[PDB]
From a paper:
Cell surface glycoproteins in the C. albicans Als family (Als1–Als7 and Als9) are most commonly associated with adhesion of the fungus to host cells, as well as more complex interactions such as invasion and biofilm formation, for which adhesion is a prerequisite (7–9). Als proteins are one of the most widely studied C. albicans virulence attributes; deletion of ALS3 produces the greatest reduction in adhesive function. The N-terminal domain of Als proteins (NT-Als)4 was implicated in adhesive function, prompting work to solve its structure. An invariant Lys (Lys-59) at the end of the PBC recognizes the carboxyl group at the C terminus of a peptide ligand, allowing the remaining peptide backbone to associate in parallel orientation with β-strand G2.
Specifically, Tyr-301 and Thr-116 side chains that flank Lys-59, positioning its side chain for interaction with ligands, were mutated to hydrophobic residues. NMR analysis showed that mutations in NT-Als3-pbc (K59M, A116V, Y301F) shift the conformational equilibrium toward a monomeric, nonaggregated form of the protein that facilitates structural analysis. Unexpectedly, the new interactions in this mutant protein also acted as a “zipper” that propagated the contacts of the flexible C terminus over the surface of the adhesin. Importantly, the mutated side chains were buried in the PBC, and as a result, NT-Als3-pbc retained surface properties of the wild-type protein. The NT-Als3-pbc structure revealed that the side chains of Ile-311 and Ile-313 in the AFR were exposed to the solvent and did not stabilize the interaction of the C-terminal β-strand with the NT-Als surface. We used structurally informed mutagenesis to remove essential contacts for ligand binding (NT-Als3-pbc) or to exclude ligand entry into the PBC (NT-Als3-gk), without affecting NT-Als3 surface structure. Loss of adhesive function for the Als3-pbc protein shows that Als3 binds free C termini of host proteins and excludes the idea that Als3 interacts with ligands using surface-surface interactions. Structural analysis of purified loss-of-PBC-function mutant proteins showed that the mutations did not alter the overall structure or surface properties of NT-Als3.
Numbering used by the authors: 0 to 312
């Protein structure tokens, strides 16, 4: 029937719950539990009606579930659907629907908790690049929307403990494609890069590179969690197979960091290994060829649930 608004009306709590062993409290590190207040009124809301909650800068929900129910006392008065932004968009949403239990008489209240990770960058995609300027370390204000009607809360974010002068890698799962997105940023040559090679290959036949979905570029500095803030182009040659992706670059400018990121499929996405190529000759003669191998593991999923109170009137 109608498309109601203002159901989610309060941002009660936004608290971190380290999913795995991350050594900092960042928005890009799971899991952040958003507790939101909701209220449905039978007099003004009818079964079938629909409401969206729009959540900017939220990458995905760190749960295997595809929906969460608004449940006041073992009873379900609405079903909500998770729509992760991932790499498709900069925001995620909750598309909900009123259940047939919400009769004119019934008024349901309560809270819902939502395991969410933010997108503070991670690839050259327009999506991550915009979302890479969404938060900064320290005290931040996070705002969700319900159709013109906003709910906000303050939260403290910590920067990364990894020193941004060395080589930097990260990884992040994309469930809607069964793909893991990984990143590689060469060590910092403060005055620019003369030459260099950089990439990553699979190890022992479990990893494959999605050649179609690569990004290669240079970043003018980085954001607080060691992710690219912008992707320009520069002078490289590109070799890419389903086995592994490598570039040989030249003629870099001071203040810029070269990076390469790509979609992959590994057998067990919560345990895999990659081999990284690493030469760089700085603007300064410091030629050094330092390849390595890095193992990548899993996150600890959480649950979305709700509780509530009902008033039969």
């Amino acid at each position: 029937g109608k498309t109601i608004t203002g159901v989610f009306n309060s941002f009660n709590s936004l608290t971190w719950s380290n999913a795995a062993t991350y050594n900092y409290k960042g928005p890009g590190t799971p899991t952040w539990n958003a507790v939101l207040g909701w209220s449905l009124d039978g007099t003004s809301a009818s079964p079938g009606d629909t409401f969206t909650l729009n959540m900017p800068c939220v990458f995905m929900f760190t749960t295997s579930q595809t929906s969460v129910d608004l449940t006041a006392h073992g009873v379900k008065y609405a079903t909500c659907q998770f729509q992760a932004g991932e790499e498709f968009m900069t925001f995620s949403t909750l598309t909900c629907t009123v259940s047939n239990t919400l009769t004119p008489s019934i008024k349901a209240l309560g809270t819902v908790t939502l395991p969410l990770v933010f997108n503070v960058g991670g690839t050259g995609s327009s999506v991550d690049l915009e979302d890479s300027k969404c938060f900064t370390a320290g005290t931040n204000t996070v705002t969700f929307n319900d159709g013109g009607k906003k709910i906000s809360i303050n939260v403290d974010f910590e920067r990364s403990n990894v020193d941004p002068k060395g080589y930097l890698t990260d990884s992040r799962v994309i469930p809607s494609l069964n793909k893991v997105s990984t990143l590689f940023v060469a060590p910092q040559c403060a005055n620019g890069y003369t030459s260099g090679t950089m990439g990553f290959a699979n190890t022992y036949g479990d990893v494959q590179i999605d050649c179609s979905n690569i990004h290669v570029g240079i970043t003018k500095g980085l954001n607080d969690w060691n992710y690219p803030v912008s992707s320009e182009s520069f002078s490289y040659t590109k070799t890419c197979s389903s086995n592994g992706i490598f570039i040989t670059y030249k003629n870099v400018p001071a203040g810029y960091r070269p990076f390469v990121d790509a979609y992959i499929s590994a057998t067990d996405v919560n345990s895999y290994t990659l081999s990284y190529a690493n030469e760089y000759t700085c603007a300064g003669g410091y030629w050094q060829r330092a390849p390595f191998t890095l193992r990548w593991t899993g996150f600890r999923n959480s649950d979305a649930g709700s509780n509530g109170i009902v008033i039969v009137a």
